[PDB]
Amino acid sequence: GSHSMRYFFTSVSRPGRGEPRFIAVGYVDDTQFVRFDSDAASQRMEPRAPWIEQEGPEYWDGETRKVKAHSQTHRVDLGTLRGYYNQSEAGSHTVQRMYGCDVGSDWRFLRGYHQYAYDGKDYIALKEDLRSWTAADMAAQTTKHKWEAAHVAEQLRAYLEGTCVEWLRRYLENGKETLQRTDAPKTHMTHHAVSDHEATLRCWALSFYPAEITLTWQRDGEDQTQDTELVETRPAGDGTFQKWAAVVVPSGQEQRYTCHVQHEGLPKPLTLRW
């Protein structure tokens, strides 16, 4: 359908002893396919999806080299940032980076991104044009000038519109059986009496993929927002996702309420009622 490939990197400094904790993960859509953890035994980029396992030794050598090198870039960064912000050597700090590309339903490039954060706040980000930088503050402005002189954006643009898209298409083909399969939500409603006068209706969506979904309540055919609760979409732990929406209603008036479920796996939205 429409698709994306993203990589996420986190480094956390350890002032008491040793080097930062480093964790990298790669995704195609909502499927994790690779990982690296500096605390793990292998010290290699590891597979996490059956369809990536077919890649040969030069793939795993190259990805391991790149991911370990990235960890050292972050190690240097943490020292430099402590200096930019005039901070002590005694505290723990965090660097985060995410980059990737989206393609359309025709598998052609739609957009690319590369974003960087220090201690959980925006630091520097590549603009949608893939040519310019957004620097949050004066420290990041210093970094911007350095990255301009090092031709960083040029390289990233080339990757995001080229390699990124090309390998995403490759993965989509190799992992067709699951990556190009949509799992429609299995839906049902439960009823929970609160008193003689009131009850909670809860609308369930289970075992769905991809994660994107919309749940809405209506009363007599109009959207209702009062007395509703909507939980964050959550992983089931088997590759799929779950979500629910609930509403409090006068006991005996349950038939007025309808739950509406929208998902890429559904040709038209579903309507549920008690």
């Binding site: 986190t10 964790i23 201690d119 939980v231 959550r234 992983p235």
Partner: protein, 99 residues
């Protein structure tokens, strides 16, 4: 920047007393990433507990899934215990099969 974790405790599959299942604790919206998460049975720490690889959302906040095999019963109480720099004491969230 310090953000406190949101917590959901739930089963992978619909819960039925006496049938094996998986107990999940999903923590999200927190910063920094160091966090203590335990799964509890009748107040006691379950020892064989695994977790997902650290990742994060658009706003840079982190999320993790902690999980273990379990069997729901009429008698046993399950919970997730979370400590984080934003909390003065560990938060205990009890598992409710309806949520």
């Amino acid at each position: 920047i310090q953000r406190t974790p949101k917590i959901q405790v739930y089963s992978r599959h619909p819960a039925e007393n006496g049938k094996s299942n998986f107990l999940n604790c999903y923590v999200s919206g927190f910063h920094p990433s160091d966090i203590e998460v335990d799964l509890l049975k009748n107040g006691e720490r379950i020892e064989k507990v695994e977790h997902s690889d650290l990742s994060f959302s658009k706003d840079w906040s982190f999320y993790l899934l902690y999980y273990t095999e379990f069997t729901p019963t009429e008698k046993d109480e399950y919970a997730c215990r979370v400590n984080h720099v934003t909390l003065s004491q560990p938060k205990i969230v009890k598992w409710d099969r309806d949520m």
